[PDB]
């Protein structure tokens, strides 16, 4: 899928296209407001923790 990730401190934002479904399966069964760490989905996001704010689906 795609991740629109925003670093509000600097005020920046960027898209990231992701594959490897069993990485992104972490996000499953979560609410908009919960947090997750990033090495589980990508080691580039090691030590990072993101919160969810929303999103869009197909259609």
């Amino acid at each position: 899928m795609k991740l629109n990730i925003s670093y509000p401190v600097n005020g920046s934002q960027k898209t990231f296209e992701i594959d490897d479904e069993h990485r992104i399966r972490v996000f499953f069964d979560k609410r908009i407001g919960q947090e997750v760490d990033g090495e589980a989905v990508g080691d580039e996001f090691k030590g990072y923790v993101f919160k969810i704010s929303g999103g869009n689906d197909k259609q």
Binding site: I5, Y7, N10, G11, S12, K14, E44, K46, G47
Partner: protein, 59 residues
């Protein structure tokens, strides 16, 4: 590890305050420090001429 597109780069707040007390708390000055001097101005280049358009002060 820092992300080239979000963490490394940083972006500006496109505007500054327009409200007086907002400025006073932005710079933490006083109830008396003559905010008219602490104004943010945005120089432009329409051509050879330039100007900064210090916006306004409501309240």
């Amino acid at each position: 590890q820092e992300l080239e597109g979000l963490t490394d780069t940083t972006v500006p707040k496109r505007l500054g305050p327009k409200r007086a007390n907002n400025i006073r708390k932005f710079f933490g000055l006083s109830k008396e420090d003559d905010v008219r001097d602490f104004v943010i101005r945005r120089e432009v280049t329409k051509g050879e001429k330039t100007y900064t358009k210090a916006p306004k002060i409501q309240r």
